[PDB]
Design a protein around this ligand. Sequence first.
Ligand SMILES: N[C@@H](Cc1c[nH]c2ccccc12)C(=O)O
Ligand SMILES: OC[C@H]1O[C@@H](O)[C@H](O)[C@@H](O)[C@@H]1O
Length: 311
Amino acid sequence: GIVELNRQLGRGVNLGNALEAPWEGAWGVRLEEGFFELIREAGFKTIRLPVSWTHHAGRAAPYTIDPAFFSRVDWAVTQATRRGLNIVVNVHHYDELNANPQAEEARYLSIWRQIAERYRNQPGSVYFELLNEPHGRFNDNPQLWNDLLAKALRVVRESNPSRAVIVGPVGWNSLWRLSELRLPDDPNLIVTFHYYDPLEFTHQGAEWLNPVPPTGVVWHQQNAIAQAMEFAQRWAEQNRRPIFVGEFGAYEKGDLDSRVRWTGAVRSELEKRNFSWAYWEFAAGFGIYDRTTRQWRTPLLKALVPEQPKL
Ligand SMILES: N[C@@H](Cc1c[nH]c2ccccc12)C(=O)O
Ligand SMILES: OC[C@H]1O[C@@H](O)[C@H](O)[C@@H](O)[C@@H]1O
């Protein structure tokens, strides 16, 4: 059942700064086959694969996805699956859809029909995730996302009757917006949120924000993580949905010891609440792996995969 499929997600990592950029490598990470074994042998069971399909799909109906790009996603799905990893395939950045859900609906639903039909025979280790971090007009009216996600789920279910589908709330997948999330009566949904609080710490010096948070911010644990994860767990129990926290992480412009405190505190609380999770992210500015030296960032890796359960 879906609770077991969520438990199977377990510990995971995002292949970020890759296929969710305008093109693969634009944000600094080209995928390599060797990433999959590296990630598996470090203790992760799952790859989350951010994919920004909008850059690669026709603007006019039937909104066909570029065949070469589609073949690259095929390759990632197959290489992860054969090497024993789960893979979450999403729709990631989509500025057009967050800005104008009604105008972009047809194109988004065509994208999901293409993905769903193409991958309908994949095993249960392949998961679909309808839309990363809804924001924009979805923040103004969260019911626009409730209505749209039901339409996208219906499309997926025409070809994938029982595949696990991962759905999050608005406010960029804020757990506080679970209150406004409404889901169909479908027994194979996993609910997701992302956790980056405090943004002033995790995104200090991130230039893709407006405003850009200042650096020099340190962090130590108080009670906010526990309060947040308990709120989310009670929502999940009230609504009988399993939970996957699909992104959490702290940017490299913060001091390393603070990032390690934060990463371990979050991972510990996630696992206390039986939330599966995926770290943001493998190899870039939040990375646990440095491709330049071909070395793990051991303090951060051990905060995710501790050698003893209380470490
Ligand atoms: N310095 C590492 C990791 C890294 C830091 N910032 C990045 C931005 C994009 C991609 C990678 C990175 C590298 O160049 O690989
Ligand atoms: O979201 C846009 C930005 O996201 C960041 O994670 C990436 O590092 C940037 O390269 C990118 O421009």
